[PDB]
UniProtKB/Swiss-Prot annotation:
Biological process, per Gene Ontology: proteolysis
This protein's name: Staphopain B
Post-translational modification: Proteolytically cleaved by staphylococcal serine protease (SspA).
Species per Swiss-Prot/TrEMBL record: Staphylococcus aureus
Oxidoreductase as UniProt keyword: no
Gene name of the record: sspB
Active site: 192, 289, 309
Cellular localization per UniProt: Secreted
InterPro entries, per database record: Cystatin_sf, Papain-like_cys_pep_sf, Pept_his_AS, Peptidase_C47, Staphopain_pro, Staphopain_pro_sf
Subunit note: In the cytoplasm, prematurely activated/folded SspB forms a stable non-covalent complex with SspC.
Length: 346
């Protein structure tokens, strides 16, 4: 008599099921280490799926990660690279990611005797409970910040397709920026770059004075406090700002190698991730979302990157050789380049 989640089908590709089973424990232990948490008995709940209000099914699989009975994390399996968005669910390669994605939200009602639908639109993720739709996680982007609230109504067509349910309850190496710490979260502005730089600068200079608001204020000293949340940041500005802060920021194309991240992290050099939706043109490096690299790790003998999405209150861990960041509205942002903040030269 526990919580159930509505889905089109409970079927999952054998390939995905095996991956999740093989890696959940390792990913959970690594993130607990990062979140300064005491280990425990980890278990994999049943995978649920997410939907757009129009009935379109999110291309990923979400597994609840349970620790001593409580849902603490979510293991996400998504298409690994661009090339995979063209293949089928059975043939594509999947990356494995762990984070606290709506874990708290599911945990609070895991024993409640009802059902929910996990939904998503351009502005975030929602839970539909007892006919009511409520926001569970916001994903502000430079493109939805100044847009009106989308129609929060569950299409009659989605309702026809949701034919079953699943139950969430049904069952060595780490290298990071020593001073990195999440001090602020982005939830009502499009300052992803600012949030990332503030955290990186605070980490590489071992201080806590940097914050997204002040950085944006420095870039646009003439914009009102009410239009500031809508202004976006750009490469040229990031570089120019870092300079004033004693850092020689350089743009580097592609995904940095596991080894480069390992070295730069040991040198106490920050790396900001630049990503853009794959819905746009690939040969047009334009800022879509920015994140902060925190370090690297090896789980079950595979290379991983540890990073922080400004929208989260905790870190995330994912295959180092994946170039796709799966966000809301079933969008996949490609990691096209990065901003590496080296030390100025004498």
């Amino acid at each position: 008599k526990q919580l159930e989640i509505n889905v089109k089908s409970d079927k999952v590709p054998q390939k995905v099921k095996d991956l999740a089973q093989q890696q959940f424990a390792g990913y959970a232990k690594a993130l607990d280490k990062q979140s300064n948490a005491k280990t425990g008995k980890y278990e994999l709940g049943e995978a649920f799926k997410i939907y757009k209000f129009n009935g379109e099914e999110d291309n990923s699989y979400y597994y609840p990660v349970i620790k001593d009975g409580k849902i603490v994390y979510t293991l996400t399996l998504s298409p690994k690279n661009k090339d995979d968005l063209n293949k089928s669910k059975e043939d594509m390669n999947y990356s494995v990611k762990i984070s606290n994605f709506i874990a708290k939200d599911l945990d609070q009602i895991k024993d409640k005797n009802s059902n929910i639908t996990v939904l998503t639109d351009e502005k975030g993720f929602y839970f539909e409970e007892d006919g009511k739709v409520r926001l569970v996680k916001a994903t502000p982007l430079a493109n939805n910040i100044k847009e009106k609230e989308s129609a929060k109504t569950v299409s009659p067509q989605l309702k026809q397709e949701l034919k079953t349910t699943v139950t969430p309850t049904k069952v060595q190496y780490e290298n990071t920026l020593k001073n990195f710490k999440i001090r602020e979260q982005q939830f009502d502005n499009s300052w992803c770059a600012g949030f990332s730089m503030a955290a990186l600068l605070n980490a590489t200079k071992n201080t806590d004075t940097y914050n997204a608001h002040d950085i944006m204020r420095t870039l646009y000293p003439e914009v009102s406090e009410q239009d500031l949340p809508n202004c976006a940041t750009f490469p040229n500005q990031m570089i120019e700002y870092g300079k004033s802060q004693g850092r020689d920021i350089h743009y580097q194309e592609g995904v940095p190698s596991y080894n480069q991240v390992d070295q730069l992290t040991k040198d106490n050099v920050g790396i900001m991730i630049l990503a853009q939706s794959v819905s746009q043109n690939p040969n047009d490096p334009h800022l879509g979302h920015a994140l902060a690299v925190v370090g690297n790790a090896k789980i079950n003998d595979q290379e991983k990157l540890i990073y922080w999405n400004p929208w989260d209150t905790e870190l995330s861990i994912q295959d180092a050789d994946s170039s796709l960041l799966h966000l809301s509205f079933n969008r996949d942002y490609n990691w096209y380049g990065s901003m590496i903040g080296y030390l100025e030269v004498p």
